[PDB]
């Protein structure tokens, strides 16, 4: 259930992120994540391209994700 969606085509993920401890709050039309369809809202975002958000300040992780936009590989723990 800890899926590792890696779908992407370089040029937007199309998601929103909430922090409690970081998970997917919404999926928006037209983005890479929406195209894949598997990372449902509420799934926890565990890893992005082998970078783990564990302990890492939610902001630092968010900035990292900002920085990544090469291909984006998301590891999510589906509810």
Curated annotation (Swiss-Prot):
Residues 1-78 are annotated as: Required for interaction with FOXK2. Phosphorylated by CSNK1D. WNT3A induces DVL2 phosphorylation by CSNK1E and MARK kinases. Ubiquitinated via 'Lys-63'-linked polyubiquitin chains; leading to its autophagy-mediated degradation. Residues 4-67 form the PDZ domain. It is found in: Cell membrane; Cytoplasm, Cytosol; Cytoplasmic vesicle; Nucleus. It comes from the Eukaryota. The DIX domain mediates homooligomerization. Belongs to the DSH family. Interacts through its PDZ domain with the C-terminal regions of VANGL1 and VANGL2. Interacts with Rac. Interacts with ARRB1; the interaction is enhanced by phosphorylation of DVL1. Can form large oligomers (via DIX domain). Interacts (via DIX domain) with DIXDC1 (via DIX domain). Interacts (via DEP domain) with AP2M1 and the AP-2 complex. Interacts with DACT1 and FAM105B/otulin. Interacts with DCDC2. Interacts (when phosphorylated) with FOXK1 and FOXK2; the interaction induces DVL2 nuclear translocation. Interacts with MAPK15. Interacts with PKD1 (via extracellular domain). Plays a role in the signal transduction pathways mediated by multiple Wnt genes. Participates both in canonical and non-canonical Wnt signaling by binding to the cytoplasmic C-terminus of frizzled family members and transducing the Wnt signal to down-stream effectors. Promotes internalization and degradation of frizzled proteins upon Wnt signaling. This is Segment polarity protein dishevelled homolog DVL-2. It comes from Homo sapiens. The chain holds residues 264 to 353 of 736 of the full protein.
């Amino acid at each position: 259930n800890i899926i590792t969606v890696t779908l992407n085509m370089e040029k937007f993920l199309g998601i929103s992120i909430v922090g409690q401890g970081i998970y997917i709050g919404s999926i928006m039309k037209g983005g890479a994540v929406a195209a894949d369809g598997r990372i449902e809202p509420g799934d926890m975002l565990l890893q992005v391209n082998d970078m783990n958000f564990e302990n890492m300040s939610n902001d630092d992780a968010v900035r990292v994700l900002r920085d990544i936009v090469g291909p984006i590989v998301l590891t999510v723990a589906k509810s």
